[PDB]
Point group: C5
Chain length 69, copies 5
């Protein structure tokens, strides 16, 4: 899966449909993987560099693959 | 969903009915989303700015949408 | 539910019956709510002020309601 | 249940059989309680004093009771 | 089980198939044990020394045994 965005988590959002949204770089992306919620918030708090891989590389795009650096 | 309150988490409360209450700004709001419990406490501890979106914007109102920044 | 004790967590204990014990003030109280385990340990570690509400306000008393400050 | 060991967590180990091993003092002990895994690692990271209670007080002994100070 | 790699976590990756990949030393290894996800990210954030034991000691190899120091 190709890299979509790389950078620090600007903000996260818990959605009504139990999905989780992350804003990295110029894109806002969501994931339906519950396990990623605490991981992503931890990355945001500690200022980790995140790389999100997805074919749906556009605002509102879904993803499941994330690299934590 | 419209913004209800924005600010830092004053306090949180675990309720008997397994719901979670948060005090942000001048409102005390609850959520039945179990996944939000650890996320909200983490935000409280680290002093993150939280934005709660809900149509039930009043004390005792329920919510599911939260922005972490 | 009335306030039982308020103060910092002196110590926590995982019990054989999968319950969680907390020592706040002069009371040792337990909870059968699994979700409260990580939350309480986090409060202990970060030195948060905790308020436990319960009608069984005595050593060995059970609780489910907790306020995190 | 009698005290077995008291001290700081030297190291932890996730085992193939989904159990969790902790080295405290001169003993290496394991627990089959999944909820204890994150709690124990947190205690290790923050340098908390841990007290493990078990009748199987010997290397390779199992436990379920832990006191966090 | 023999030691494969020892060192600090270079990076972690959540995969599409719900597995978790870790890069330690010169190897990139994965695990299908969900409980290890938060533990490994915590070790990465706090800079812990990790030792991964596996017979599949090669890039793309699977593991379940990890020592946290
Ligand atoms: O968490 C949401 C979702 O993330 C991953 O899927 C993403 C999109 O949700 C999904 O629509 C997208 O589909 C791709 C096909 O995989 C690809 O073969 C085709 O060429 O393009 C479409 C749309 O661009 O895939 C992305 C992931 O790259 C995850 O796979 C999915 O299970 C779910 O978790
Ligand atoms: O966590 C509890 C609850 O949060 C969310 O619902 C909130 C209130 O609990 C709910 O009563 C409220 O419903 C609104 C509708 O959104 C609105 O369209 C209609 O006109 O009036 C009712 C009554 O105010 O909605 C808020 C959230 O905006 C969440 O949606 C719900 O599933 C549940 O988790
Ligand atoms: O975690 C265990 C338990 O916590 C809460 O219950 C507490 C005690 O365990 C329970 O014995 C106690 O019962 C009360 C009644 O609620 C009250 O109506 C009556 O007058 O007195 C008895 C004896 O004190 O209630 C406390 C809670 O205040 C929680 O409610 C329960 O579900 C369970 O999780
Ligand atoms: O996590 C593993 C396991 O921990 C606890 O059990 C421990 C040993 O695994 C168990 O063999 C041991 O049994 C004791 C009897 O309880 C005691 O009555 C008798 O005198 O001696 C035997 C052997 O020493 O007990 C320890 C706990 O003290 C936990 O109880 C168990 O459910 C499980 O989680
Ligand atoms: O998390 C994935 C996986 O990790 C552990 O298994 C690893 C490999 O996935 C598995 O193929 C490998 O199997 C070995 C046998 O242990 C060995 O006895 C035999 O001779 O060769 C095969 C092929 O290398 O073992 C490693 C771990 O050592 C874990 O055991 C497994 O349940 C699963 O979680």
């Amino acid at each position: 899966t190709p890299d979509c965005v790389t950078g620090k988590v600007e903000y996260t959002k818990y959605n009504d449909e139990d999905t989780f949204t992350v804003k990295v770089g110029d894109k806002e992306l969501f994931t339906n993987r519950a396990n990623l919620q605490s991981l992503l918030l931890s990355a945001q708090i500690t200022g980790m560099t995140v790389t999100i891989k997805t074919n749906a590389c556009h605002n509102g795009g879904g993803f499941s693959e994330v690299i934590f650096r």
